[PDB]
Amino acid sequence: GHMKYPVEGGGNQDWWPNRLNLKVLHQNPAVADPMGAAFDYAAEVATIDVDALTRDIEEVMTTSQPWWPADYGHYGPLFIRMAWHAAGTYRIHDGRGGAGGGMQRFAPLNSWPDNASLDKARRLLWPVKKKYGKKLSWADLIVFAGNCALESMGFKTFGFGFGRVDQWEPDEVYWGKEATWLGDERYSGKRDLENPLAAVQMGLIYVNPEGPNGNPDPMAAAVDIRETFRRMAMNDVETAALIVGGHTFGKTHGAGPADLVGPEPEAAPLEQMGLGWKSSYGTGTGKDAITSGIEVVWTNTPTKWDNSFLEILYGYEWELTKSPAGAWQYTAKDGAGAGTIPDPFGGPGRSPTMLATDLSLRVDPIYERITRRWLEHPEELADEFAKAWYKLIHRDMGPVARYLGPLVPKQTLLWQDPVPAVSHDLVGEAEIASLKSQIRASGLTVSQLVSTAWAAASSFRGSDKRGGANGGRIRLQPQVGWEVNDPDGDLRKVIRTLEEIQESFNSAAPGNIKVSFADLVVLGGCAAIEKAAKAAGHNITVPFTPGRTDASQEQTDVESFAVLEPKADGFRNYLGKGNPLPAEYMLLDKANLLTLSAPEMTVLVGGLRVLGANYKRLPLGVFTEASESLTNDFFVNLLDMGITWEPSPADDGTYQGKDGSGKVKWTGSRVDLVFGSNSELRALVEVYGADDAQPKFVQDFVAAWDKVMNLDRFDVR
Amino acid sequence: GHMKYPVEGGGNQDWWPNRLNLKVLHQNPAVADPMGAAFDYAAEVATIDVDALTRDIEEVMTTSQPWWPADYGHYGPLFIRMAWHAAGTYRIHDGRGGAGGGMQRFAPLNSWPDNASLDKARRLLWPVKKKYGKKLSWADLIVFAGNCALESMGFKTFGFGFGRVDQWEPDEVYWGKEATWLGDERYSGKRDLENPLAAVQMGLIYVNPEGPNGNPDPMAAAVDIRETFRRMAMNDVETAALIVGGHTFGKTHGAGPADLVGPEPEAAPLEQMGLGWKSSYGTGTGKDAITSGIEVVWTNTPTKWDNSFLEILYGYEWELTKSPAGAWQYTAKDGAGAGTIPDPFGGPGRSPTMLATDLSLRVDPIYERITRRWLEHPEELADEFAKAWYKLIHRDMGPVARYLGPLVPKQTLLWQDPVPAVSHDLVGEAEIASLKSQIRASGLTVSQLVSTAWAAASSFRGSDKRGGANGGRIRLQPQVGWEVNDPDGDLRKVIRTLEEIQESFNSAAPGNIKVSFADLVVLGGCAAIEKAAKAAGHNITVPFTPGRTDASQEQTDVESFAVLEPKADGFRNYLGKGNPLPAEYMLLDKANLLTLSAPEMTVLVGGLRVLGANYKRLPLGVFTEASESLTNDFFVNLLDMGITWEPSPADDGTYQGKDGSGKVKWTGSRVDLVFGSNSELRALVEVYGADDAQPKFVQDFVAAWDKVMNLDRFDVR
Ligand code: HEM
Ligand code: HEM
């Protein structure tokens, strides 16, 4: 092998392949952003003329371009696929993927096999982005064009929201271990897909259209359709609704051999200006277009919304056959419906066709019942598709406070993890002072207050922006019962107390001022930190932002919140079972999800340890003699060359730090020690452990603690 | 099984290995900096009590720590080696390496074979870092400790200066293509070393202590020593002094088998807290320590400065032998000098020993004269060493204005590319204005004013902070001939015409307000843009900062200025022969050395292109119909889907852009088209190419233009 220049590959990771990669904590650096610092997209889009924008998109859709002629003279279907794939990479496990960042325009998504041709699809929309500039992001545009396509072809969508902010660097996400496109090394046991993956192969949006492993078995394809969609937050009814709804439009492309198609976008020549899959088959486009290799046209209404997909799916019997490219697909038996389906450009007319995956909707018992019902009651499909497509394109958007524009529906949706609207005057400076005092007099320890606040706030993840302290869901199922927040003998006592303080406060509250349990949880932690700081001799006030509301069990989808449970949280020195990598890597991943930087992650760990936020109050990493006190003892002791570390005799995970006598003075985990071992983390440790660092430590820690508490507060920004 | 989670392995470089890595323009990301944006190291170091620091460092040198006992009860020599290596990575070709950023404490330098044991060395200084904190960087401390060591042992140095700001992410540098430590794939023909390397093997700091590729030939070694040192700005006299000077102290370490030495820092276990090379021979420390594997104690006074090194080198005859770790080294023949050399821990006398490289000083003709002389004139050694040691430790400090503290000698040095101190008053806001109007009215073209100013300013490289427009060296020898600046042409005329403006203005305009040539070169450029701006409906005023002074050819070491010559500059669409990588990669490297971000670079290429700054007024990337007007026509045409790009028939690295009629409308190079092909750069282009970005392009272009013009102005910041 050979080492390359940094500009052509880089280094370090090359000498230490498994080396922890701290670049995960500084994704999308301000340095790479072309927009100013004062630039706020929300304020730009809120100004856009939606009506004018729709007409412009409608113009592109019906204005074919010679470098990629529009099937049936309408890029509409193409755009629906584009939007479906854009939001289609979403996974419920870590909440990554999705259309929220417009990652389809960057590697590796832009060059995924399943995304072939979408490069022309996006190029076609340049005229629009050009006209609206900064008032419209690609992320919003790539998916609004999909919504627009539907509406111009007869389907009334439920609504739409803008707010997706463009990024300038691709988000590095784990898509699997396969180093070969379409590879598959992600199954164990009885067809069990590895987490967090939500696709059956490397490079696909969901499943193989030719059936599992290319086996045209519709009944088997269904099991995979059911799971990958479930992992993309869609039940049986939504999955069926989505497939039918989409395949009611357009067609597939496979006019010729798939080996006449050149290299993907990221591997193509410069002269191709970012486009990929250049075909040498005939004209290489339009009538001779090759995308998937399949040559299917589901309905006789490619550019119109109607119940044809199902009338056709059930109207004929199917047989297995191949396309010009040699892929599996189905055609009506006995030459039925011959010459019934219109051609995209010329027009010899063709006969019905379906994908193995389309037949799963009729062969599978559950799907069959769903689509049968819609075969007889088409109105029901129209509805389900609306709800499902709305969800599909907005899943990773986060709190509804982020949906901007005149097309956002007013209705509340359970999958949006709803929170009640503020219904009273908010607590002010005086009230916030009083409560902090009432909470310090409640009897709750610093550890309990701090732990409860962290547990509640740290449930947020920047990927799909779900979770957080708003809603006060820490006292509802399933959070009240997570092992990490371990109720065993304390969380329940903290909740009851805060609830009493809320009760007593609201009844005595001044003129129409009331506080929520949700704010109390967070305020409790802020009150505890100020106390601890004083104990350490640092009179400081911890920022607090009121406004959180309390959600009810009924407004909280238990099953949906399952994915937010921490299987690991080094900030609390917690390591559950079944994580992909060792504890330290899991810490960086958590840090990533909380949107923390290396310094912030560092300051938080040290603070949390000495404050007693450790799971089960374990002594790991609690390198301090003090209690209830916010000091920098963690970093000072971590750099103490007087203590000798060795892995503990029994299990690993735990280490022992012996001193001179040979006695054990400290005990720590892989998370604790990595800060003293890693050359880049240590640098950050030598900063907060210096003699002049105590006051800076307290400042940064309080700032970071404040950032976590407000991770989910899009209502005030 | 190959692809890894981002938190571990990585991402996109994996599917596309030779992928243009833009992260080279995201170096040392602000978000990864724990100090805060308002942190001013200079303000802090001015606060430090240098005397106290020295005493605190002397107390470290004489206090032996149990985990790594001190040879002769003094860590001074160890600190000298630590410091020399800190600065000894500096390569002349790109100006990278050096002790400027304290990179020795990060990967990969912290684990290099040649940096073995320095891990304990740095650890020993933590107590000093602990006490001075933010007022003292590891960068200054590491190299300053080496300076203190020298002094404590009897050598008076020329002086020392602080100002090296610590960084929080390793600088990614190309150190060779070898994927094996100590490997060698860097030589061709008759000992020709591939640029920009300054070492003979991978992981070494100059040459191999046992001779070329392990061949103990002193005459051969000298060839490598002379060569590697030259690429580190040291000549024969300096090289000889440096070697003699350093080996006047300490010893080497090779008491047992190397195989008994554990993994390096970056690859060692967490419990080692950042230290590697844990040896299992004896105590793996002090008495039984192994570092290079060679066992040599050069003089009989390891912790004192005298002329013993040279008296021994010439006092005996040398025979080849082997250290306990089986390494080549020399001993005195006839068993002379028995027990005449002290043991680091009380053992009995040893015997005079030397490295093949030490014998190079006596066997090589040129070195021999140099050293033989110092044998009878130690005062000359002392003098040259001090000069060389000073240079070595500050080589990458940039303009002397950056030297901080009370130990900086005022003596002017030629290797610092001296610039006259401002002697007159500086042009005011009225004079500036008048001066611009004079230049605009002069008669030079925007393509001459803009191009020359760039030719001048772009000479700067952020690696060692050399180059820049200060000094008006654009009209002095080295630079005036550079093919890039294309001497054979208008360079002369503009120089001659600008000088005629300096005189006219200075000859008649008392008040003590006088202006230099250096400033006029830049100002003329700031005027050409204002004009070119207006000539596009934009009454704007480009920022200008006076203060540049005019150096003299005498104050300009021509050969030292050789390395700063561009072998390519995508900003002027210039490509010379001999570049390691294709034009696009060289474009990134250049932007890196100019300290530019992705957006800054983008806005800068599209800008210069339209102003006619291209090398030899070439039409490449000149996507505009307008003459010399500042518009984003470049970005707007590059995104013109109505143009088809195809490599020029003449395989001359150019491309053609034909319109609908099949006629050639534009021509461009790889550098021009990369911005429309690379998904991340095309994104930036799509920002500056929109209908609403015209005012932003100009605003951004100017900002980035102002930045390049000021790169070297440390005298005013
Ligand atoms: C079970 C999962 C699915 C599979 C295996 C699948 C497969 C495919 C394939 C192979 C094509 C042809 C691509 C080409 O060669 O151009 C296609 C096209 C398309 N699909 Fe799907 N699909 C699935 C789900 C969906 C969903 C849920 C939607 C709803 C938004 C959808 C909407 C579309 C549209 C609109 C096209 C037309 C593209 C065009 O006309 O150019 N698909 N699909
Ligand atoms: C021709 C270039 C040079 C070569 C090949 C070379 C090689 C070596 C080797 C092999 C060691 C032994 C390391 C160990 O095992 O502990 C050493 C030590 C040392 N060198 Fe050099 N060296 C060179 C130049 C220099 C220069 C220019 C200086 C002074 C600025 C210097 C200062 C030192 C010091 C102070 C030590 C001893 C550190 C201690 O006592 O632990 N060397 N060198």
CA-only gyration radius of chain A, Å: 28
Q: Where are the beta strands (DSSP E) in A85-153?
A: none
Mutate to test the interface with A, among B2, B3, B8, B593 (most CBs of A within 10 A): B8
Closest to B417 in 3D by CA, of B401, B403, B399: B399
DSSP code string of B9-60: S-SGGGTSTT---GGGGS-S-GGG-TT-TT--HHHHHTT--HHHHHHHHHHH
* Rounded to 5°, angle at Cα A453 from A449 and A459: 150
Atom of ligand 2 nearest to the CA of B83: 30
Cβ proximity of A116 and B694 under 8 Å: no
**Nearest listed ligand to the Cα of residue A353:** 1
Q: How far is the CA of A203 from the centre of ligand 1 (A)?
A: 15
Orientation of helix A491-508 relative to helix A517-535, angle to 10°: 110
What's the CA gap between B616 and A384, in Å, rounded?
65
- How long a stretch of residues is chain A? 717
Mutate to test the interface with B, among A2, A4, A8 (most CBs of B within 10 A): A8
What's the CA gap between B431 and B457, in Å, rounded?
22
What's the CA gap between A57 and B519, in Å, rounded?
52
Q: How far is the CA of A302 from the centre of ligand 1 (A)?
A: 12
Given B298, B305, B328, B666, the catalytic residue: B298
Closest to A276 in 3D by CA, of B582, B679, B621: B679
Would you give the DSSP letter of residue A641?
A: T
What's the CA gap between A12 and A6, in Å, rounded?
10
Residue A336, C-beta contacts closer than 8 angstroms, at least 6 positions apart: A316, A317, A351, A352
What's the CA gap between A501 and A515, in Å, rounded?
10
Overall CATH class of domain B568-695: mainly alpha
Cβ proximity of B454 and B708 under 8 Å: yes
Q: Which amino acid is at A637?
A: N
CB contact under 8 A, A29 and B34: no
| CATH (one of 3.30.70.260, 1.10.520.10, 1.10.260.40, 1.10.3720.10) for A422-567+696-717 | 1.10.520.10
Q: How far is the CA of A693 from the centre of ligand 1 (A)?
A: 58
Which segments of B184-257 does DSSP mark as H helices, in order?
A: 218-230, 236-246
**Kind and range of the H or E element at A188?**
strand A187-188
Question: How many beta carbons lie within 10 A of that of residue A345, not counting itself?
Answer: 14
Nearest to B108 among A11, A134, A673 (CB): A11
Per DSSP, the three-state class of B658 is: strand
Cβ proximity of B468 and B712 under 8 Å: yes
Q: Which amino acid is at A665?
A: K
CB contact under 8 A, A31 and B30: yes
Would you give the DSSP letter of residue A69?
A: P
Instruction: Output the six-digit token pair for B405.
Output: 């503290």
Q: Which residue of A has its CA nearest to B600?
A: A34
Label residue B496 exposed, middle or buried (CB < 10 Å: 0-12, 13-18, 19+): exposed
Residues in chain A whose C lies over 2.5 Å from the next residue's N (breaks after): none
Beta bridge partners of A341: A350
Beta bridge partners of A353: A331
Orientation of helix A365-376 relative to helix A308-315, angle to 10°: 120
Q: Which amino acid is at A542?
A: V
Q: What share of chain B is helix, strand, coil (3-state, %, to 5)?
A: 45, 5, 45
Ligand 2 atom 19 nearest Cα: B81
Q: Which residue of B has its CA nearest to A106?
A: B679
What's the CA gap between A696 and A701, in Å, rounded?
8
CA distance A101 to chain B (A): 13
Residues of B in contact with A32 (CB under 8 A): 22, 25-26, 597-599
Where exactly are the structural domains of chain B?
A: 42-171+389-400, 221-254+290-388, 422-567+696-717, 568-695
Cβ proximity of A61 and A49 under 8 Å: no
What's the CA gap between B329 and A291, in Å, rounded?
68
Would you give the DSSP letter of residue B489?
A: I
Q: Which amino acid is at B207?
A: V
What's the CA gap between A549 and A518, in Å, rounded?
6
B617: left (phi over 0), alpha (psi -120 to 50) or beta: left
Cβ proximity of B313 and B354 under 8 Å: yes
CA distance A197 to chain B (A): 12
What's the CA gap between A310 and A298, in Å, rounded?
10
Residues of A in contact with B691 (CB under 8 A): 130-131, 133
Q: In this complex, how many residue pairs, one in chain A and one in chain B, have their CB atoms less than 8 Å apart?
A: 316
Residue A702, C-beta contacts closer than 8 angstroms, at least 6 positions apart: A529, A533, A540, A542, A543
CB contact under 8 A, B129 and A686: yes
Cβ proximity of A449 and A700 under 8 Å: no
Decide if B42-171+389-400 and B422-567+696-717 have a common fold: yes
Given A85, A253, A394, A538, the catalytic residue: A85
Cβ proximity of B124 and B60 under 8 Å: yes
What's the CA gap between B446 and B530, in Å, rounded?
9
Q: How far is the CA of B331 from the centre of ligand 2 (A)?
A: 17
Preceding amide of B487 cis, omega within 30: no
Ligand 1 atom 40 nearest Cα: A250
**For this structure, is A181 an active site residue?**
no
Preceding amide of B365 cis, omega within 30: no
What's the CA gap between A614 and A671, in Å, rounded?
12
**For this structure, is B253 an active site residue?**
no
Instruction: Output the six-digit token pair for B148.
Output: 């203190």
Spell out which residues line ligand 1, taking CB within 6 angstroms. A 71, 77-78, 80-81, 84, 117, 206-207, 209, 225, 242-243, 245-247, 249-253, 291-292, 294, 355, 357
Per DSSP, the three-state class of B540 is: coil
Across chain A, which distance is largest between two alpha carbons, in Å? 92
| CATH (one of 2.40.50.100, 1.10.645.10, 3.30.1340.10, 1.10.420.10) for B221-254+290-388 | 1.10.420.10
Q: Which amino acid is at A600?
A: E
A224, A243, A330, A389: residue to mutate for ligand 1 pocket, most atoms within 8 A of CB: A243
Residues of A in contact with B123 (CB under 8 A): 641
Residues of A in contact with B67 (CB under 8 A): 641
Cβ proximity of A468 and A459 under 8 Å: yes
Placement of tokens 């193409």 in the chain: A78
Backbone angles phi, psi at B95, to 5 degrees: 75, 15
Beta bridge partners of A471: A550
Label residue A346 exposed, middle or buried (CB < 10 Å: 0-12, 13-18, 19+): exposed
Q: Where are the beta strands (DSSP E) in A474-596?
A: 568-569, 574-575
CB contact under 8 A, B19 and A169: no
Q: How far is CA A706 from the centre of its chain?
A: 23
Tell me if B2 is assigned to a ligand binding site.
no
* Rounded to 5°, angle at Cα A641 from A639 and A646: 95
Cβ proximity of A165 and A138 under 8 Å: no
Q: How was this structure determined?
A: X-ray
What's the CA gap between A531 and A526, in Å, rounded?
9
Cβ proximity of B709 and B526 under 8 Å: yes
Label residue B535 exposed, middle or buried (CB < 10 Å: 0-12, 13-18, 19+): middle
Count how many Cα atoms sit within 13 Å of the Cα of residue B363 in the half-sphere of its side chain: 19
CA distance A48 to chain B (A): 13
Parallel/antiparallel/unpaired status of strands B192-193 and A192-193: unpaired
Spell out which residues line ligand 2, taking CB within 6 angstroms. B 71, 77-78, 80-81, 84, 117, 206-207, 209, 225, 242-243, 245-247, 249-253, 291-292, 294, 355, 357
Would you give the DSSP letter of residue A546?
A: -
What's the CA gap between B241 and A336, in Å, rounded?
95
Cβ proximity of A598 and A22 under 8 Å: yes
Would you give the DSSP letter of residue B646?
A: E
Question: How many beta carbons lie within 10 A of that of residue B532, not counting itself?
Answer: 27
How far lies A633's CA from each of A347, A687, A688, in Å?
78, 12, 9
Q: Which amino acid is at B246?
A: G
State the Cα torsion A594-A595-A599-A603 to the nearest 10°. -20
**Kind and range of the H or E element at A591?**
helix A583-593
Question: How many beta carbons lie within 10 A of that of residue A315, not counting itself?
Answer: 13
Preceding amide of A108 cis, omega within 30: yes
Instruction: Output the six-digit token pair for B624.
Output: 């505009």
Closest to B395 in 3D by CA, of B81, B96, B716, B712: B96
Question: Helix (H) and strand (E) counts for chain B?
Answer: 23, 10
CB contact under 8 A, B7 and A35: no
Preceding amide of B108 cis, omega within 30: yes
Count how many Cα atoms sit within 13 Å of the Cα of residue A432 in the half-sphere of its side chain: 16
Residue A250, C-beta contacts closer than 8 angstroms, at least 6 positions apart: A71, A76, A77, A78, A80, A81, A297, A298, A302, A303
DSSP code string of A252-268: --BSS-TTSB---GGGS
How far lies A451's CA from each of A485, A487, A646, in Å?
8, 12, 29
CA distance B677 to chain A (A): 4
Given A68, A138, A277, A298, the catalytic residue: A298
Closest to B453 in 3D by CA, of B189, B78, B145, B710: B710
Q: Which amino acid is at B670?
A: R
Placement of tokens 């995970």 in the chain: A653
Label residue A177 exposed, middle or buried (CB < 10 Å: 0-12, 13-18, 19+): middle
What's the CA gap between B24 and B96, in Å, rounded?
14
Residue A717, C-beta contacts closer than 8 angstroms, at least 6 positions apart: none
Cβ proximity of A272 and A278 under 8 Å: yes
Closest to A426 in 3D by CA, of A713, A43, A707: A713
Beta bridge partners of A330: A320, A354
Question: Helix (H) and strand (E) counts for chain A?
Answer: 23, 10
What's the CA gap between B382 and B241, in Å, rounded?
8
Ligand 1 atom 18 nearest Cα: A252
Overall fold of domain A42-171+389-400: Peroxidase; domain 1 (1.10.520)
Residue A662, C-beta contacts closer than 8 angstroms, at least 6 positions apart: none
CA distance B697 to chain A (A): 10
Ligand 2 atom 37 nearest Cα: B250
Parallel/antiparallel/unpaired status of strands A655-658 and A644-647: antiparallel
What's the CA gap between B517 and A493, in Å, rounded?
78
How far lies A647's CA from each of A17, A670, B658, in Å?
23, 10, 68
Burial profile A33-66: b = 16 or more Cβ within 10 angstroms, e = fewer: bbbeeeeebeebbeebeeeebbebbbebbeebbe
DSSP code string of A306-373: SSHHHHHHHHS-EEEEE-TT--EEEEESTTTT-S-B--SSS---B--EE-HHHHHHHHSHHHHHHHHH
What's the CA gap between A554 and A575, in Å, rounded?
31
What's the CA gap between B579 and B653, in Å, rounded?
14
What's the CA gap between B94 and A349, in Å, rounded?
66
Q: Which amino acid is at B119?
A: D
Cβ proximity of B320 and B216 under 8 Å: yes
Q: How far is the CA of A113 from the centre of ligand 1 (A)?
A: 13
Beta bridge partners of A568: A575
What's the CA gap between A72 and A356, in Å, rounded?
24
How far lies B151's CA from each of A121, B304, B548, in Å?
70, 10, 37
CB contact under 8 A, A7 and B581: yes
Atom of ligand 1 nearest to the CA of A206: 2
Q: Which residue of A has its CA nearest to B263?
A: A16
Q: What share of chain A is helix, strand, coil (3-state, %, to 5)?
A: 45, 5, 45
